């Protein structure tokens, strides 16, 4: 019957995709080692979908049937063109624009005043944001996830410095006039942070704190439970499972 | 009860961290090492050797350089307490014996 | 991409433990005497 034919088909498709991804990762590691046979084509590593799933989708579809990111039309045809998936992160032009205005504002402030914190915390963060915006131009890969994480880290550091320490060139005579506060730069960096969180940050979710022995107390894997036992220093405690 | 069940299945690590790890294996060793080094005099035995023996007896593990208790006893112990004395003695006995200064 | 085929052409050339403490209350309560005395 259905709802179990469908479940079995989804399980088979997911397992085939996992096996294909593992196979191309291991084949990549062996081809970079020069341990591949002569018939191997590294262009096969550009085949993202599993071949069997690609064939099944071919069978299904044969038996059934302001100027950024991409183009732009502006109130004539294709009006909702910004929402089309162009391949990049939504916040790419926002982080590139923020990098540009941060570098320009830092250089201008250091020229106008003489303080070197505006240029050092200016262009220095703008280069990191520009690299993150370059890495976010293909937001379907590990460089895309790393770019959005680096951009969030830079903007969060800007917000933290602004609301905790403050800006050196903004130092004034009175203690109440010093007042680190949250000005337009901190507001823009916090808005970029919220934009990253509310558009896309999932990816590299395998990197977290190592699993506790409390995770694997009810785990059905004796080997995994014993591995966590041994890694967390217990090791010789009787398992009795 | 449904929400408690859901949250208990979600967390499963933070509960072990807060019930087993956070005091007994994270905060309490730090507190007792800092407290001992704050209490005992600036002596080699009281700052290094006696806490080494007491930690070995209390925990069953000798503070090997791969163990954070060794580094806590090296910083808050040797470095903070007996290293000034060692420094003075060294700069007045060994450093000239090495031909320097 | 624009340099997809050119890049293809030129690339094809034309210990076991954690750094964590051990509990000291598994054998004695005596380590708890340092906290109030130091406080």
């Amino acid at each position: 019957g259905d709802r179990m034919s469908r479940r079995l088909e989804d399980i088979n498709k997911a397992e085939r995709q996992r096996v294909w991804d593992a196979m191309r990762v291991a084949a990549a590691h062996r081809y970079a080692a020069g341990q591949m046979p002569a018939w191997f084509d590294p262009e096969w590593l550009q085949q993202e979908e599993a071949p069997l799933n690609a064939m099944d989708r071919m069978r299904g579809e044969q038996r059934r049937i302001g100027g950024g990111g991409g183009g732009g039309w502006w109130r004539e045809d294709d009006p909702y063109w910004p929402l089309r998936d162009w391949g990049d992160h939504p916040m790419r032009w926002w982080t590139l624009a923020f990098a540009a205005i941060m570098a320009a504002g830092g250089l201008a402030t250091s020229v106008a005043t003489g303080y070197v914190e505006p240029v050092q915390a200016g262009l220095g963060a703008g280069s990191l944001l520009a690299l993150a915006g370059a890495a976010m131009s293909d937001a379907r890969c590990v460089p895309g996830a790393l770019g959005v994480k680096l951009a969030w880290a830079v903007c969060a550091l800007i917000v933290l410095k602004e609301v905790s320490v403050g800006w050196q060139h903004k130092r004034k005579r009175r203690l109440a006039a010093s007042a680190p506060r949250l000005e337009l730069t901190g507001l823009a960096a916090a808005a970029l942070c919220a934009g990253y969180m509310l558009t896309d940050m999932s990816g590299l979710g395998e990197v977290a704190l190592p699993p506790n022995p409390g995770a694997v107390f009810k785990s059905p894997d004796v080997a995994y439970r014993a591995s966590v036992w041994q890694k967390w220093g217990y090791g010789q405690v009787q398992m009795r499972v | 009860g449904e929400r408690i069940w859901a949250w208990r299945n979600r967390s499963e690590n933070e509960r072990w961290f807060w019930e087993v790890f956070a005091w007994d294996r994270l905060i309490f060793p730090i507190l007792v090492i800092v407290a001992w080094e704050y209490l005992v005099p600036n002596h080699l035995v009281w700052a290094v050797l006696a806490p080494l023996a007491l930690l070995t007896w209390m925990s069953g593990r000798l503070p090997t350089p791969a163990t954070p208790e060794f580094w806590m006893l090296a910083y808050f112990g040797f470095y903070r307490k007996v290293w000034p004395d060692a420094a003075a003695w060294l700069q007045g006995y060994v450093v000239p014996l090495m031909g320097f200064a | 991409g624009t340099y997809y085929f050119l890049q293809k052409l030129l690339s094809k050339y034309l210990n076991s433990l954690y750094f964590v403490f051990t509990q000291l209350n598994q054998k004695t309560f005596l380590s708890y005497w340092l906290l109030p005395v130091a406080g």
């Binding site: 107390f217 036992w229 217990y234 405690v237 | 007994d24 | -």
Partner: peptide, 6 residues
């Protein structure tokens, strides 16, 4: 270490 901890 301790049995009840794990």
């Amino acid at each position: 270490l301790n049995r009840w901890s794990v």
